[PDB]
């Protein structure tokens, strides 16, 4: 109930005029008070529409101001252009900043003036520094300045923060006021005519620097921020790569005293094991050279922090490093050109001096792995291989974005990248031809996409036709199925929903063991991903073809084979200005259904082959190998204790034995630590990277102004948990300015805390971080019932596309390819289902979501709605709440810290209850109703849809399942077995878990199966109503946890819930009408 | 390696407790015994492989024939079954008997 005050103060500060008037609007669940609210509304509109003072009425209707619930605030203020400068002149009396063109290697990667690089607008491009975000620089400046103004009179540590951030904002605003502010257009782009006379990279620098200075709480933070903001103004290509590089070595210097272990995907079992750090001497020289480059670039304080730490190498002072490791990724993206970014990859040194003893073993191991993956289904004639075509044709929605192509659905033209739509187009014009796989050669080279991530190189993405997906789908899915239970594949080994996110290194760490970890992200243009890689798979396919008797399977195998033939010679469209280059690239990259598992295979075989050469000079026992994409690690144990020289010699031998296969590598050997893309360990403690740029994005998505605010709050939560903390008030200011909507040129609306923090498709944040909020009140129930009535909307584009002829043809062909003679009973179901996967096409989603937002705004303006009894979650919690009783408890501390970077309250919880050990279906996949869909398809259906489907008669369940590609006999068998009554409970478990973010955010990190949390939860047992006791225990757990988070202390609970209410609620169970947004989830693991 | 007769080595003094600190110096013996306990915890092996913690509890539940979704209530048989406790007990018992 404080957010709205900051909204009011922001409004008062930004507008400031006599003409600027401020108009709240309220609502109440009680009829009489509601009519009094309507009255208040009326009188407010009139008085505003008559230039009368509003401050007078606010007293007469004090009751509405005190007890009713706010929605929004209007604002009447005219243009009043250029007020940003009229505020900013005061914070800019320092000196502006001068670029240095001789810092970056290239010419255009310097922060020089646009006209010095793009005299003509016809060759101008804002794409090398496009923020790609629907929020303005002026927004950011207003927010920063408002924060500075409200914290302009405090005298405490807060003032020590204020002086620091004020100096930083001075550094920024001096540079800005030297020239001026670029003005955003309607599309939030920045045209030539504003940047024509200004530095090209001022905007990205500005946003990143604002984001940093809003994340300064200490002296060392100030040093880091002042040392990057002034250097990120010129260097924009060689900065995050620099400071983020030494970290990989530092982790190899921290002695373990206490460890965490893994067993199964979230299991832990700590160890009091002590392990030293046998680091050789030459890596210190490496680190010294790295710090010398760091100083040579112009860095003084941050080498000093990295230099004074090495005297002790302690893990208590170490989070600074981790903090530093996150301060590198909040400087921005290196959005350079497609060409020069590709040439980071497209440099090749291919030689007729490598072994053949090595490549032949490599090829053979790949062959054998392929056969191990595919022996059983190829032999037992599995349905998904026979009908691989239709399987891929249904799962096209889970594919990559094909090249843009001009379609027409009756009487329109569309430029979709979605491959299902391509298939729909090509079926009509006789072009659908899945057996003829297109070549990829001089006559038809491949486009590209760029996979970026700051502080690293740019990776490339193939953008293929839609035949390759269809061919690869079924076989790669069977390969994944094989890899679910294989230990060595760390991208997949789990129990059907989790990943090995905590790593599996620390089992066999000891004084006798070592571990070699290695980055393998540059190994795409390499000589070992060309011919041998492809030919191994071709050989395996030949074996498998001779290992089957059915013909559909052999056809599928021959198509996957021919795909591998064609990918062996592959050219690449890359523009450079007007003309287009096409380069011979007979190698591997992403943009394929195959790249992930196949790269894991090839890296596994490669390391198995190399690791049998150290054996020529050492005796060791390979304990564990793991491969996950852009890294891989193998642990190995010796007959004796480890020394520095064995580490050195093992590393040199690994490097040279990779060189024998013409393979570059920074070989890294250690005893306690690793560093990889997604995580890293020091001293037996897992850290994470907090590198998510908020005010700058990688590319331009398709969501609205609204949803990006939710995304930004989620990224804030993530980075906070990671360690990188930004001042929350800034985030709230951005959220209000991004949820602000213009009803006219001068009318503008601003929603409130009770619209943005309520569980719906419009949730954006929470009043208290790390805590979803529910509703015990009339009013939250009231607006939630209201908003569910409005979430369901239409898209005319989808309606007209689905009414054309090509859509009908596609449905007809699906049918007669699956089943026939029910053209008006099931086929409509399949068309209705295809509608569910047209919505992936972005303009459809925009039409529908903008419609929802408009419907929301046309009831923020006018009074409120009763919504007609539609049951939701807060309806249930409203009835559960009045039979609780809290009492102060006191739990002790008995669980170990292993994620230091967390906030101290979350850690206090982890330090009092356990960390999670299981994982329940967030997608409802293990449910026996879902194991049919996961057998004949990949499709998700959301747990809302399943939760509804079970509530229906036993008839339409069959139609709904058949519409998802399933046949009729197994659906009939599912209904006859009566397993859905055995599956209501699993579906509801997953539903309730998804609604309340238990597997999304902080609550993903907590053990609710604990004995310690449970002894507080004293709910006696009644029996024969499982849903009620389930929700009761869950809700009580959430109560205890939220009280803990917001107040630290603990409490007990008690609910002697009457049987009458048990039964009254049992029927409200499977009639819930609620829904939560995808954009609101904040996965701690990205 | 073979070591010559030119070589030498010094032997430690491993003569037992001349003081009998287990005779009415309980505050010191508490510290000594705690030190040896925590040292012994650092050498007891971790239980590298077990049976999974959910593939067990369903077998237990069907043996017990329990109401559905009692998993989150943990009918008292099923409380604190996790690993991170089995290793803890295995470690504690041995380290205690040693110290």
């Amino acid at each position: 109930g404080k957010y709205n005050l900051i909204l009011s103060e922001y409004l008062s500060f930004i507008y400031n005029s006599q003409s600027a008037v401020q108009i709240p609007i309220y609502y109440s669940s009680n009829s009489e008070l509601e009519n009094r609210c309507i009255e208040f509304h009326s009188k407010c509109l009139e008085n505003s529409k008559n230039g009368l003072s509003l401050k007078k009425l606010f007293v007469e209707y004090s009751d509405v101001i005190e007890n009713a619930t706010l929605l929004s605030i209007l604002s009447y203020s005219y243009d009043k252009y250029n007020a940003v400068e009229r505020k900013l002149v005061k914070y800019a009396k320092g000196k502006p900043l001068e670029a240095d063109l001789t810092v970056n290697e290239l010419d255009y990667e310097n922060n020089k003036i646009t006209s010095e690089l793009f005299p003509t607008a016809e060759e101008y491009t804002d794409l090398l520094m496009d923020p790609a975000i629907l929020t303005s620089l002026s927004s950011n400046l207003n927010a920063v300045m408002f924060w500075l103004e409200k914290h302009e009179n405090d005298v405490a540590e807060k003032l020590k923060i204020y002086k620091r951030r004020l100096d930083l904002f001075t550094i920024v605003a001096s540079t800005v006021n030297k020239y001026g502010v670029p003005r955003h257009n309607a599309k939030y782009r920045y045209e030539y005519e504003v940047m024509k006379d200004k530095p090209y990279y001022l905007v990205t620098w500005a946003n990143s620097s604002i984001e940093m200075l809003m994340s300064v709480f200490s002296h060392e933070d100030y040093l880091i921020a002042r040392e990057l903001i002034v250097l990120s103004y010129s260097n924009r290509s060689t900065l995050a790569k620099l400071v983020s590089s030494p970290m990989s070595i530092l982790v190899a210097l921290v002695d373990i005293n206490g460890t965490f272990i893994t067993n199964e995907e979230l299991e832990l079992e700590f160890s009091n094991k002590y392990v030293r750090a046998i680091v050789p001497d030459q890596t210190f020289d490496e680190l010294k050279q790295m710090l010398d480059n760091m100083r040579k670039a112009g860095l003084t304080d941050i080498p000093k922090m990295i230099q004074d730490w090495l005297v002790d190498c302690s893990i208590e002072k170490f989070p600074l490093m981790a903090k530093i490791y996150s301060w590198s990724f909040h400087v921005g993206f290196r959005k350079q050109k497609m060409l020069d970014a590709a040439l980071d990859q497209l440099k090749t040194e291919y030689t007729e001096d490598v072994d053949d003893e090595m490549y032949r073993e490599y090829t053979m191991l790949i062959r054998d792995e392929v056969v191990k993956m595919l022996e059983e289904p190829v032999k037992h004639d599995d349905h998904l291989l026979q009908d691989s075509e239709l399987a891929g044709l249904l799962s096209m929605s889970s594919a990559s974005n094909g090249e843009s192509r001009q379609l027409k659905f009756g009487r329109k033209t569309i430029f979709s990248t979605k491959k299902n739509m391509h298939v729909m187009d090509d079926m009509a014009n006789g072009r659908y031809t899945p057996g003829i796989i297109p070549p990829v050669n001089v006559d038809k080279p491949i486009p590209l996409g760029r996979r970026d991530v700051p502080g690293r190189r740019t990776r490339i993405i193939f953008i293929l036709p839609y035949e390759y997906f269809i061919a690869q789908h079924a076989v790669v899915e069977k390969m994944l199925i094989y890899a679910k239970h294989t230990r060595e594949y760390a991208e997949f080994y789990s129990q059907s929903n989790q990943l090995l996110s905590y790593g599996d290194v620390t089992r066999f760490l000891s004084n006798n063991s070592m571990v070699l970890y290695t980055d393998v992200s540059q190994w795409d243009s390499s000589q070992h991903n060309t011919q041998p890689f492809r030919k191994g798979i071709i050989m395996g396919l030949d074996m498998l073809a001779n290992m089957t008797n059915d013909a559909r399977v052999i056809q599928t195998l021959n198509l996957y084979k021919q795909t591998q033939i064609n990918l062996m010679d592959s050219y690449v469209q890359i523009p450079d200005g007007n003309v287009i280059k096409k380069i011979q690239y007979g190698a591997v990259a992403s943009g394929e259904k195959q790249t992930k598992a196949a790269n894991s295979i090839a890296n596994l075989a490669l390391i198995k082959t190399v690791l049998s050469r150290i054996s020529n000079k050492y005796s060791f026992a390979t304990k564990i190998i793991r491969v996950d994409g852009d890294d891989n690690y193998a642990v190995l144990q010796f007959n004796t204790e480890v020394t520095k020289q064995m580490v050195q010699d093992v590393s040199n031998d690994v490097r040279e034995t990779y060189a024998r296969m013409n393979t570059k590598v920074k070989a890294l050997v250690s005893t306690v630590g690793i560093e990889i893309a997604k995580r890293y360990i020091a001293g037996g403690k897992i850290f994470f990277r907090a590198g998510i740029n908020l005010l700058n994005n990688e590319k331009k998505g398709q969501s609205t102004q609204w949803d990006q605010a939710a995304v930004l709050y989620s990224n804030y939560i993530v980075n906070r948990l990671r360690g990188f903390e930004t001042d929350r008030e800034f985030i709230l200011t951005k959220i209000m300015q991004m949820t602000s909507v213009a009803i006219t040129g001068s009318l503008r609306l601003f929603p409130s805390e009770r619209v943005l923090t309520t569980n719906s498709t419009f949730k954006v944040f929470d009043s208290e971080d790390f805590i979803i909020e529910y509703g015990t009140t009339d009013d939250e129930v009231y607006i939630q019932r209201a908003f569910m009535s409005l979430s369901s909307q239409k898209s005319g584009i989808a309606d007209e596309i689905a009414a054309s002829s090509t859509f009908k043809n596609y449905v007809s062909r699906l049918s007669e390819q699956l089943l026939f003679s029910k053209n008006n009973i099931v086929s409509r179901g399949i068309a209705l289902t295809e509608k569910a996967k047209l919505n992936s096409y972005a303009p459809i989603s925009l039409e529908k979501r903008r419609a929802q937002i408009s419907a929301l705004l046309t009831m923020l303006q006018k009074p409120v709605t009763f919504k007609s009894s539609k049951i939701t979650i807060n309806d249930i919690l409203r009835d559960i709440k009045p039979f609780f009783t809290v009492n102060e408890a006191h739990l002790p501390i008995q669980y170990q810290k292993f994620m230091p970077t967390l906030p101290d309250n979350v850690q206090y919880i982890i330090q009092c209850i356990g960390s999670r050990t299981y994982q329940i279906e967030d997608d409802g996949s293990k449910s026996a109703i879902s194991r049919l869909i996961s057998k004949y398809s990949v499709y998700k259906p959301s747990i809302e849809e399943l939760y509804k489907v079970i509530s229906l008669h036993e008839n339409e369940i069959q139609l709904y399942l058949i519409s998802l590609g399933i046949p009729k006999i197994d659906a009939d068998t599912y209904v006859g077995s009566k397993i859905y009554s055995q599956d209501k409970y699993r579906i509801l478990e997953s539903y309730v878990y998804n609604l309340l973010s238990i597997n999304y955010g902080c609550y993903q990190l907590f053990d609710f199966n604990s004995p310690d949390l449970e002894k507080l939860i004293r709910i006696p047992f009644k029996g024969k109503i499982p849903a009620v006791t389930f929700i009761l225990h869950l809700y009580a757990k959430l109560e205890v946890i939220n009280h803990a988070i917001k107040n630290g202390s603990w409490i007990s609970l008690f609910c002697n819930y009457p049987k009458s209410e048990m039964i009254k609620l049992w029927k409200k169970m499977w009639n819930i009408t609620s829904l939560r947004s995808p954009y609101t989830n904040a996965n701690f693991f990205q | 390696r073979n070591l010559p007769s030119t070589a030498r080595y010094i032997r430690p003094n491993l003569l037992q407790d001349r003081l009998n600190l287990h005779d009415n110096f309980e505050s010191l013996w508490d510290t000594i015994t705690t030190s040896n306990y925590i040292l012994a915890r650092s050498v007891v092996p971790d239980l590298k492989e077990l049976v999974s913690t959910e593939a067990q509890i369903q077998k237990m539940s069907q043996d017990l024939q329990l109401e559905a979704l009692t998993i989150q209530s943990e009918t008292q048989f099923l409380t604190g079954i996790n690993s991170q406790a089995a290793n803890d007990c295995f470690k504690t018992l041995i380290a205690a008997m040693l110290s």
């Binding site: 046998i278 090495l310 020394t643 520095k644 | 390696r1």
Partner: peptide, 28 residues
């Protein structure tokens, strides 16, 4: 400058001395 740099090289030698290496070195 570089005097302190050589001291940085040096102070990371005396610390963390391993025993097997000095044994084989005494013998060798």
């Amino acid at each position: 400058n570089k005097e302190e740099s050589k001291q940085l090289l040096e102070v990371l030698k005396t610390k963390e001395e391993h025993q097997k290496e000095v044994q084989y070195e005494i013998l060798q």
